[PDB]
């Protein structure tokens with residue numbers, strides 16, 4: 001997991017209902033949340049890339065990458081797993 005709860009909280013915090021992300025089925029395809037795929041993706045890539053100084057072109061953007069939260073956790077875990085107390089930070 002390497003802070004898997006933070007990953008679900010990170011994306012869920014963008015639009016979490018009155019339920020704590022820990023009580024939300026993080027098994028939901030973020031595709032419905034595709035909202036993050038375009039607007040949030042730009043903000044996430046700019047922030048995520050700034051912390052690791054990774055070129056945005058290095059990674060290709062596609063809806064399949066956000067098909068599920070677990071798929072994103074493996075990609076990030078494969079390279080790095082940074083725990084964050086809140087998405088704002």
Ligand SMILES: *P(=O)(O)OCC(C)(C)[C@H](O)C(=O)NCCC(=O)NCCS
Nearest residue numbers: 034035036037038039041061062063064
């Ligand atoms: P937004 O979230 O609507 O943008 C969709 C994303 C970022 C997933 C991307 O555009 C996409 O749909 N994947 C295919 C690649 C693509 O269409 N690039 C957009 C410029 S042609």
